[PDB]
């Protein structure tokens, strides 16, 4: 199910974005 | 100048905090 | 810190942000 793949990868981005806001 | 840019990055980092919060 | 590290963070922020725009 893509309904969940998209979700998990969306939360993956939000991770890395949280990390890059930390770094700045 | 780096003061103004630093201000910009301050605004930016704040914005990203909001964005990531809403995500 | 060094200019190079700053350049890498900005470039990665651009890419991650673009991906976020792909997924939503």
Swiss-Prot record, chains A, C:
**Full protein: residues contained:** 1 to 22 of 514
Q: Which domain of life is it from?
A: Eukaryota
The record's subunit annotation is:
Homododecamer. The precursor form of aminopeptidase 1 (prApe1) assembles into dodecamers and further aggregates into higher multimers (the Ape1 complex) in the cytoplasm. The Ape1 complex is disaggregated in the vacuolar lumen, but mature aminopeptidase 1 (mApe1) retains its dodecameric form. Dodecamer assembly in the cytoplasm is essential for formation of an enzymatically active complex. If cytoplasmic homododecamerization of prApe1 is disturbed in mutants, homododecamers of mApe1 will form in the vacuole, but they are enzymatically inactive. Interacts with ATG19.
| Localization terms from the record | Vacuole
Family from the record: Belongs to the peptidase M18 family.
The name under which this protein is listed is Vacuolar aminopeptidase 1
Q: What else is known?
A: Present with 5730 molecules/cell in log phase SD medium.
**UniProt organism field:** Saccharomyces cerevisiae (strain ATCC 204508 / S288c) (Baker's yeast)
Role of this protein: Resident vacuolar enzyme that catalyzes the removal of amino acids from the N-terminus of peptides and proteins. Also acts as the major cargo protein of the cytoplasm-to-vacuole targeting (Cvt) pathway. The precursor form of aminopeptidase 1 (prApe1) assembles into dodecamers and the propeptide mediates the aggregation of dodecamers into higher multimers. The multimers are then recognized via the propeptide by their receptor ATG19, and ATG19 further interacts with ATG11, which tethers the APE1-ATG19 complex to the pre-autophagosomal structure (PAS).
Modifications after synthesis and translation: Synthesized in a precursor form (prApe1) that has an amino-terminal propeptide. The N-terminal extension of the 61 kDa precursor is proteolytically processed in two sequential steps. The first step involves proteinase A (PrA/PEP4) and produces a 55 kDa unstable intermediate (iAPI). The second step involves proteinase B (PrB/PRB1) and converts iAPI into the 50 kDa stable, mature enzyme (mApe1).
